[PDB]
């Protein structure tokens, strides 16, 4: 998303000309601009023919610039939806789907007739063997192996789909380089979240949120008052002398209407939804998108371990003597059973350092144990040397149980890692230590001050976990959440959600298992987990593609960024009208009231050029604010009053100063280039 | 003249706040349905005699009650003015009014505007000005305070449907707030020199030898509620500068205090009822900053008044044309801003004879919506629409949901707030546009050019915004002017009352969330400045072209 691809921009220029009134009817703020453009075009045609007196060139230039303005708004809106469609069908992974072989019985060896997508339904069984793209979503049954999940994640890292375990659900088409794994398609293609997202982006079904239609109500009210103010200038100035010409009235009207936010609102909504899609989170409704940023209490829940912390950056330095290739192989095999982002990033960095990737897990028939928060130490069981990894205290307990000791070199390396700032993780073969690896912190201190900033926003972060209470306190202390709740029954969880909703506060919940479905159905925001169940996925309304429960704060940030962008552009477009008056009003009344030149605060050239420069700026400001609408505003986490002060200081002063400079520079360019 | 004006504003605001805080404490009890101390015991038997049983009814029934009372008052006032000469207390045997003038000054007095396109000293009779004008001056004020009572109750009630009893509220207001204060104000006016009698007109043989006829009548009793209810319906043609109606500068000070009394009292009561006085402090600061700025601008523009006076042979260039002598230029400017921003039709100085810049600011305060200490209750629920727009915009700034006082403000309230904001500038612009095409509307002009357009715009905005202050040079006794302005007053009051009551009926159904740290503080200098900027920008971006073609053109000419 470089925001200006050549093919996207040229298809955008092709598709922006669809500006017929049947498509402009649903936007009144710019249907006013379209009607004014048509009216001034008819007026310019009449002046060129000679039916009415005039110059037939100033009105033609005004008409062309108003058409350029409506084309720029359609340019922005169609750019947003084109980027959304490009991201959606980039993350689409069905692709070829020309080989979907059948299976008779759930056992190795059956009729494997390869027929391309012969009406796959819920409850069917298919097979993939070393390269076959997954036909449809489902659960692996027997003999699961390592797959390259990239079409749904964006990373070429190997993730094992363990048969009969936590890594059971398969999502979309992917690359499989091992074989002999059977899956059962529990859903039909079309009702999945990927297919729903594709069907939602492929069309005009982009129904606005209630707060969006409230913003359009405000824009329509401003449109009505500005239309009345501009339309009533004909009698007021017609009594005082010659009447003000209609084209100046229409140009002043278009300069008055909040054209910026009125053309960028759909772009803001689609750009924010596409940004959350690029954050590995797929939603189903813009109402849920806004309600995500509208929450007050936040629930961070998973049925198994929680261990809130990313710690994505790593260094992978033993300083022992054993080579980093075998170190990375050891860490990858140990963390292949880990669904946490820390272990996932360990595997990612090991892969991008050395090309381990596929490891042929079915060679030794290793039994996999997942991460346990009560022990904070897990691995796999290939052979007698059961290779494993974990935290410092847990691995010290493990090595003292197995009859070993910490070498002074790895002790000094752990001390160096702790002094530099990280969580020391070390992989052990089961009988002899290999070397500690580092988990370098995310940006500044990570999850702790991110939760501090969220609490500075007045957002409650309630820890939900299923393990024992004693380890939950340590996990809460490591994370930074104010209060915790451990081994919560589903009835108590639903009661807590209804208790938080009883005071009116919105709630956001993460959930994986099928026991979280009654809570996610009645929760205001329900982000599902791909490590969980398809039942919970369908019960919720948003799906997390990274399998990370800590992405809820990023989703909240995006949902708040959309609203901040809407309000900032609305206030910018409202405040621009002061300089629009200071450019147009002293120049519109040039022959009616010649004394109205002291109001010309800017030394502009001519009345025929001041309105033209104002219209040029009103056209160009939409293009100049397309990158702002696509990116969102600069999000600075602060107290709500501080964010209000910063947004006012930026955007209100921008609306009160930038149009002055822009109109002055445009008029200066026109004078030095001789167009007027 | 720079320190005298500052001292005048300072002592006016100080005495106003000192007098208005206990009245706010009293009005909080009427909002909370708590009977006043001593009024209970007789209140129940009065309600039992009148047939009201304290039926807690919703917004639809409350609105129907207020509207039905107002149409009943309109019918009885129209019939009283039509059949005036059949009624008693007519010592001059004045004939009945024409249909256009009667309808105009009936809708005008019912809709709390009190536009006067006539001369009351030789147009209306004593019984008319006793029982059709004073009655409606009480009743329209009581209706406005009842509607703002409903709005404050809707803000303070948690998940209910009812909004109190309109008849009980009207009775409580006009028996324990209006009459007990208007009696003291009228008695003070009588002591200072205002008229209260029913003698016929006194023939006077002057010192020189000519003859003049002094008009009598119940002037002070009407004038007390005229000031208290922000009414502006004068007994005489000189609306509040007649020596029989405003005899003393002390009377003038009491007049200004009474005009800002009930708006400030209602702001204090709104602050008190929530239990958080910071909201009332926010509203009072937001009103007072704009009020002080406007008063200072008008005082300076009137001191730097007529430029031709200094070079035409006079002593100073001060603008004393159309101003009284017992009230100075500063006092007249302050009174002009007080009445014009407060939606009171009272004028001491003739606003038509003002400097262009010094008369633009009153008409600007008129056209921004009567929100700077505006109306009587009507200013307060005209202020809470700009407050709703401000909390919406600030909620989109901070990224949270738009809410105010713990209540979510949804799409329906945006619709109704937008319509209530739209209704009055639409009326001003279309009424002025209609008046500036018709020859019958352009033939009432007195001053030529941009000041004449300012006259037409001032009259239309006075009808639409329910102010009643007039550029008196306009001859608005024509049937076209009477019908146009009567329509403007009628729909400009009842297109603000209806959406505000619909907002109230939407707000009763919700419950207030707890004020957590995520909710922005609605008090504070930040939100006071944001609200001031919101109301100033909205009222300016819709009327800068009209001001530029009117008073700005006259000032720069």
């Amino acid at each position: 998303a470089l925001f200006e691809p050549t093919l996207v921009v040229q298809a955008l220029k092709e598709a922006v000309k669809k500006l017929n009134p049947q498509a402009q009817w649903r936007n009144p703020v710019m249907f006013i601009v379209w009607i004014g453009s048509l009216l001034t075009t008819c007026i310019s045609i009449a002046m060129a023919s000679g039916a009415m007196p005039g110059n037939a060139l100033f009105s033609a230039a005004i008409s062309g610039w108003l058409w350029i303005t409506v084309l720029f708004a359609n340019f922005a809106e169609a750019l947003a939806e084109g980027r959304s469609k490009a991201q959606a069908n980039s993350l689409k992974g069905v692709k070829k789907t020309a080989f979907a072989r059948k299976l008779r019985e759930p056992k190795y060896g059956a009729a494997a007739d390869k027929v391309p997508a012969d009406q796959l339904r819920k409850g069917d069984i298919v097979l993939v063997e070393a390269g076959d793209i997954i036909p449809c979503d489902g659960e692996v049954i027997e003999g699961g192996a390592s797959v390259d999940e990239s079409a749904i994640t964006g990373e070429s890292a190997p993730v094992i789909r363990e048969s009969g375990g936590d890594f059971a659900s398969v999502t979309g088409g992917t690359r499989i380089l091992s074989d002999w794994l059977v899956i059962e398609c529990s859903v039909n293609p079309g009702e999945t979240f990927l297919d729903r997202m594709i069907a939602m982006v492929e069309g005009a079904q982009r129904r606005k949120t209630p707060n969006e239609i409230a913003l359009t109500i405000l824009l329509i009210a401003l449109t009505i008052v500005f239309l009345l103010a501009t339309a009533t200038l004909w009698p007021f100035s017609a009594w005082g002398g010659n009447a003000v010409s209609v084209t100046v009235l229409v140009a002043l009207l278009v300069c008055l209407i909040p054209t910026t936010i009125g053309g960028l609102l759909s772009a803001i909504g689609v750009a924010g939804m596409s940004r959350m899609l690029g954050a590995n989170v797929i939603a189903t409704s813009g109402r849920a998108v806004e309600a995500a940023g509208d929450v007050d209490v936040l629930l961070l829940n998973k049925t198994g371990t929680i261990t809130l912390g990313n710690r994505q950056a790593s260094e992978f330095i033993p300083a022992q003597g054993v080579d980093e290739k075998t170190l990375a192989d050891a860490a990858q095999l140990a963390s292949l059973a880990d669904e946490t982002p820390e272990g996932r990033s360990i595997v990612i960095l090991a892969k991008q350092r050395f090309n381990l990737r596929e490891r042929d897990v079915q060679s030794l028939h290793a039994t996999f144990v997942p991460f346990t928060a009560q022990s904070r130490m897990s691995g796999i069981n290939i052979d007698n040397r059961m290779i494993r990894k974990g935290s410092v205290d847990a691995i010290r307990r493990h090595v003292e149980a197995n009859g070993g000791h910490f070498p002074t070199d790895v002790d000094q390396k752990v001390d160096q890692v702790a002094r530099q700032g990280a969580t020391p993780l070390v992989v052990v073969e089961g009988s002899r230590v290999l070397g500690v690896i580092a988990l370098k912190d995310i940006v500044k201190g990570g999850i702790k001050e991110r939760f501090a900033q969220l609490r500075k926003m007045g957002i409650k972060t309630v820890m939900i976990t299923g393990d024992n209470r004693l380890t939950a306190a340590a996990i809460a202390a490591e994370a930074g959440v104010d209060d915790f709740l451990a081994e919560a029954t589903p009835e108590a969880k639903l009661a807590l959600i209804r208790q938080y909703q009883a005071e009116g506060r919105l709630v956001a919940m993460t959930g994986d298992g099928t026991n979280d479905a009654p809570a996610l159905a009645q929760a205001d925001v329900a982000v599902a987990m791909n490590s969980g169940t398809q039942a919970a996925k369908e019960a919720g309304n948003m799906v997390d593609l990274d399998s990370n429960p800590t992405k809820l704060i990023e989703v909240v940030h995006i949902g708040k960024q959309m609203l901040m962008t809407r309000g900032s552009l609305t206030t910018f477009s409202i405040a621009n009208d002061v300089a629009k008056y200071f450019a147009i009003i002293p120049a519109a009344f040039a022959a009616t009231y010649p004394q109205l030149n002291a109001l010309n605060i800017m030394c502009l050239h001519s009345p025929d050029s001041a309105i033209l420069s104002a219209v040029i700026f009103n056209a160009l400001i939409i293009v100049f604010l397309i990158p702002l609408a696509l990116k969102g505003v600069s999000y600075k986490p602060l107290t709500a009053s501080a964010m209000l002060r910063r947004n006012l200081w930026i955007y209100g002063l921008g609306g009160l100063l930038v149009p002055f400079i822009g109109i002055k520079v445009i008029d200066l360019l026109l004078t030095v280039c001789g167009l007027v | 003249m720079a320190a005298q004006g500052f001292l005048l504003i300072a002592t006016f605001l100080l005495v106003l706040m000192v007098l208005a805080r206990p009245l706010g404490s009293g009005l909080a009890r009427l909002i909370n349905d708590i009977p006043l101390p001593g009024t209970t015991g007789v209140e129940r038997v009065l309600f039992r005699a009148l047939g009201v049983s304290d039926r807690e009814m919703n917004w639809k029934q409350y609105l129907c009650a207020i509207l039905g009372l107002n149409m009943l008052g309109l019918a009885v006032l129209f019939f009283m003015l039509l059949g005036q000469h059949y009624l008693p207390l007519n010592p001059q045997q004045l004939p009945g009014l024409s249909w256009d003038l009667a309808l105009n000054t009936a809708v005008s007095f019912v809709t709390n505007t009190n536009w006067q396109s006539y001369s009351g000293e030789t147009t209306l009779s004593y019984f008319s000005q006793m029982a059709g004008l004073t009655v409606q001056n009480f009743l329209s004020a009581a209706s406005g305070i009842a509607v703002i009572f409903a709005l404050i109750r809707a803000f303070t009630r948690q998940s209910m449907s009812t909004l109190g009893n309109a008849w009980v509220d009207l009775l409580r207001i006009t028996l324990w707030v209006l009459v007990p204060v208007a009696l003291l104000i009228a008695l003070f006016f009588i002591q200072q020199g205002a008229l209260q009698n029913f003698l016929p007109y006194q023939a006077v043989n002057t010192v020189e030898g000519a003859q003049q006829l002094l008009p009598m009548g119940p002037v002070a009793s009407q004038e007390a509620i005229k000031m208290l209810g922000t009414n502006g319906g004068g007994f005489f043609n000189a609306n509040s500068s007649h020596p029989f109606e405003n005899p003393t500068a002390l009377t003038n000070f009491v007049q200004m205090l009474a005009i800002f009394l009930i708006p400030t009292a209602l702001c204090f009561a709104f602050g008190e009822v929530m239990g958080d006085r910071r909201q009332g402090r926010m509203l009072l600061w937001a009103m007072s900053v704009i009020f002080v700025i406007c008063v200072g601008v008008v005082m300076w523009a009137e001191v730097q008044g007529n430029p031709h006076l200094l070079a035409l042979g006079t002593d100073s260039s001060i603008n004393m044309e159309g101003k009284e002598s017992r009230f100075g230029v500063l006092v007249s400017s302050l009174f002009a801003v007080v009445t014009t921003a407060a939606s009171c039709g009272a004028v001491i100085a003739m606003h038509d004879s003002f400097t262009a810049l010094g008369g633009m600011v009153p008409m600007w305060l008129m056209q921004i919506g009567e929100v700077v200490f505006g109306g009587v209750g009507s200013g307060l629920y005209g202020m809470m629409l700009f407050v709703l727009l401000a909390v919406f915009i600030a909620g989109l700034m901070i990224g949270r949901t738009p809410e105010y006082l713990g209540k979510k403000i949804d799409v329906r309230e945006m619709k109704l707030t937008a319509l209530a904001i739209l209704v009055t500038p639409t009326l001003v612009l279309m009424g002025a546009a209609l008046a500036m095409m018709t020859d019958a509307g352009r033939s009432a002009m007195l001053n030529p050019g941009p000041h004449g357009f300012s006259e037409v715009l001032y009259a239309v905005s006075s009808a639409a915004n329910n102010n009643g202050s007039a550029f008196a040079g306009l001859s608005a006794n024509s049937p076209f002017w009477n019908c146009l302005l009567a329509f403007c007053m009628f729909v400009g009051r009842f297109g603000v009352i209806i959406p505000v009551m619909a907002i109230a009926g939407s707000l009763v159904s919700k419950k207030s969330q707890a004020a957590s740290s995520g909710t922005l503080p609605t008090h504070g200098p930040l939100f006071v400045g944001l609200l001031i900027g919101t109301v100033l920008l909205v009222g300016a971006l819709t009327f800068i072209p009209a001001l530029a073609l009117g008073p700005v053109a006259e000032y720069l000419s």
Binding site: R26, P28, F31, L39, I213, T216, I217, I224 | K415
Partner: peptide, 27 residues
């Protein structure tokens, strides 16, 4: 007044009615 004034008044009234309908029915 003339035909231009009449068609301008009808155009402004039509736009005002369309915007009022849009505000009443937020599609």
């Amino acid at each position: 007044m003339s035909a231009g004034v009449i068609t301008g008044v009808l155009l402004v009234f039509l736009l005002l009615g369309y915007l009022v309908y849009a505000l009443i029915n937020a599609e």
